[PDB]
Structure 1
Amino acid sequence: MHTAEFLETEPTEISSVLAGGYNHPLLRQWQSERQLTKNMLIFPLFISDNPDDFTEIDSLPNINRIGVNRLKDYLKPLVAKGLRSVILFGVPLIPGTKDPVGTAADDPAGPVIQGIKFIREYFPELYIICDVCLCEYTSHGHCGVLYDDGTINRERSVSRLAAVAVNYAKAGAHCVAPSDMIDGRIRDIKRGLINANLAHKTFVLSYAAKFSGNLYGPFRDAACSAPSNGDRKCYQLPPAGRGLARRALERDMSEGADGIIVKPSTFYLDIMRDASEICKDLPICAYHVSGEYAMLHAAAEKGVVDLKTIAFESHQGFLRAGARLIITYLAPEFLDWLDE
């Protein structure tokens, strides 16, 4: 007969024994370096220049293009459930608006500045973040101003970007989040805010560690910002570029960032950990990108995972990795979930 062999073993070493720490569900909570609270959540809004817009994108629930007359009905119950902050993206759909230097980016009649005024009026307690970039506003779809050869013009780009960011702050944004990844733009935006007497009022949340990759599909559909020719590989960081991420984090903090965003999130959790060391004195924010969000929905429909369950697992992972803030398309779900 094959029988069950048992080796002779020595007494238990105390050093081996971890189990006393997580044998009960309250202890598995205790083990977290930080807990998931409502005020950590930042929800992206896509504002259309059609004020009556309410267009669903890629069949996902929490990616809609919304016009300003539709915003109050949409935000009211979200704010009702404890939503504390929004991140605005503009989607000017009117023809002839886009041009090679992104003129419409700070159009006072544009959806970002219209949305800022709407929200400061109707939801004065909401904390407003605006994305700062030109890709949603250039005819070529790139994040900066280009040389005739299609490459990025650093100085011209950061000059333009700094104005857009000051102009959003002037309009009433509490926070600017430059997502352009163009060398030295945070320095110029900070100097711009300082010269505008707005630096003491405006949080600069840099997308300091922002990676090129395959996970921005749906966003590009909703903000209609895809590059026209080529890609973002010479300004967004290469996925294998740990050393470049670390340097971009040190740079942006040195240049005035008050907080940093790591994006994408799940797929770059190790960079979050790297950021939690380099940028230990600053808030770190994870961006659960549209590709990551729709990947979870896809997996959950195919029965691979449970949506609420993997949502909590992924979002706790951000916090485990060092983030104390989260931009996520699942904010409406967590405003309900964290209640129970």
Structure 2
Amino acid sequence: ANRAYPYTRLRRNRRDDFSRRLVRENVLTVDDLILPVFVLDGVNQRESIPSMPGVERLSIDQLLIEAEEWVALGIPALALFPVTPVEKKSLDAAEAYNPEGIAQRATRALRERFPELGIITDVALDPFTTHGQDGILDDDGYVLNDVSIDVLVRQALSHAEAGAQVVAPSDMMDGRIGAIREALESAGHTNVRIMAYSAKYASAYYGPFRDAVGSTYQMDPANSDEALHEVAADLAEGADMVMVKPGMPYLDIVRRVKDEFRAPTFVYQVSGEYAMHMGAIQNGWLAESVILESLTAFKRAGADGILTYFAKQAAEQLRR
């Protein structure tokens, strides 16, 4: 310590590329990327999403075609988000555990064609209920929890049966991680991993996602200590990996979570973060180098893995 100018000039290591490379503390690699994908029900179709320029909803045959290039680029995993047809939404959310639902069909197709690619499914009831609430309601509109926990467990088990290696309770509820963990073990799916959405905030950054998928419990953005209690509870319940969401607006949370628990920590660069960046890049306001700058921030902040709609572009860039 006691470093003082001019004995210490911090620009000396910045003088040349070689010394900036030798002291460089972090680096993003393709091992850090997870690509979220919106999956349609039909055959031979793609749809553009107005608020997520460059992102497409894909039927499963199209998903398989694009996955050939994602696998060649080395992306380790995908996170699937089905786009449920409105006629499949119900009150009992039976579509969540249908072995022929989009998520289950997509995961069987991908596990068969690309055996080493990781598939992370979404465990939640909101994409399948007519009302759009994440749970089954009683006559007055209040959540019945064990009826809902029951369908979620059937959902997670159906994902495990389709071959998913990871399930992600994307909900922000209590009791689900343990029930799913317990049910998977109970049913013999001992190596299915549970990626919990641990510190998930009530945020305006999810806007574009509601367009993509066709749609009191999320955390207050002001709170930071509360996120550590959320992650601790998920860890205690058996989560294998924990996630912070949204991402860049919560980088201080990523840093605190990694420092406190030293566990596998993930971060979601959500639809609104992607949309802001891409709109600015397309308008000529920001250079495309901001994509890698934003992703290296997650590594510097302490994330092991990043769910990002820029995964393909970033993997292509990681070459330079």
How high is the TM-score relative to the length of structure 2? 0.92
Aligned letter for 1:300? I
Deviations 1:126-183 (A, max 9, x none): 1111111111111111222234443444433333222211220111000001101111
Instruction: Name the CA distance, whole Å, in 1 between partners of 2:139 and 2:174.
Output: 19
Q: Which residue of 1 aligns with 2:34?
A: 42
Instruction: Name the CA distance, whole Å, in 2 between partners of 1:302 and 1:320.
Output: 28
Task: State how 1:272-283 maps to structure 2 within 5 Å.
Answer: 272-280=254-262, 282-283=263-264
Q: Give the alignment partner of residue 326 of structure 1, picking from 284, 298, 306.
A: 306
Deviations 1:187-209 (A, max 9, x none): 1110011101112x111110101
Q: Which residue of 2 aligns with 1:25?
A: 17
Whether the aligned pair in 1 keeps the contact of 2:79 and 2:119 (CA below 8 Å) is yes
Deviations 1:98-129 (A, max 9, x none): 11232101211111111011101111121111
Q: Which residue of 1 aligns with 2:172?
A: 181
Q: Which residue of 1 aligns with 2:202?
A: 212
The count of residues paired between Structure 1 and Structure 2 equals 318
**1:265 pairs with 2:247:** yes
Q: 1:102 to 1:22 in 2, by over 3 A?
A: farther
Instruction: Name the CA distance, whole Å, in 1 between partners of 2:93 and 2:26.
Output: 40
Hey, which bits of structure 1, 4+ residues long, moved more than 6 A? none
Instruction: Name the CA distance, whole Å, in 2 between partners of 1:216 and 1:83.
Output: 24
Instruction: Name the CA distance, whole Å, in 2 between partners of 1:320 and 1:99.
Output: 43
Whether the aligned pair in 2 keeps the contact of 1:44 and 1:328 (CA below 8 Å) is yes
Task: Report deviation, 1:279.
Answer: 2.5
- Superposed CA RMSD in Å reads 2.0
Q: Give the alignment partner of residue 248 of structure 1, picking from 196, 219, 230.
A: 230
**1:337 pairs with 2:317:** yes
Instruction: Name the CA distance, whole Å, in 1 between partners of 2:51 and 2:272.
Output: 13
Whether the aligned pair in 1 keeps the contact of 2:266 and 2:306 (CA below 8 Å) is yes
Q: 1:18 to 1:75 in 2, by over 3 A?
A: same
Q: Which residue of 2 aligns with 1:228?
A: none
Q: Which residue of 2 aligns with 1:140?
A: 131
Q: Give the alignment partner of residue 280 of structure 2, picking from 299, 304, 307.
A: 299
Whether the aligned pair in 2 keeps the contact of 1:158 and 1:182 (CA below 8 Å) is no
Q: 1:271 to 1:59 in 2, by over 3 A?
A: closer
Aligned letter for 1:47? V
Deviations 1:267-321 (A, max 9, x none): 00011011112331x2111111010000011222333321x22111111110111
Which of the two has higher C-alpha Rg?
1
Q: List alignment gaps of at least 5 residues for structure 2.
A: none
Q: Match of 2:232, SS? A: helix
Q: Give the alignment partner of residue 194 of structure 1, picking from 174, 181, 185.
A: 185
Task: Report deviation, 1:30.
Answer: 4.4
Q: 1:304 to 1:157 in 2, by over 3 A?
A: same
Whether the aligned pair in 2 keeps the contact of 1:144 and 1:182 (CA below 8 Å) is no
Q: Which residue of 2 aligns with 1:125?
A: 116
Instruction: Name the CA distance, whole Å, in 1 between partners of 2:111 and 2:19.
Output: 41
Q: Match of 1:20, SS? A: coil
Instruction: Name the CA distance, whole Å, in 2 between partners of 1:72 and 1:106.
Output: 22
Q: Which residue of 2 aligns with 1:313?
A: 293
Aligned letter for 2:301? A
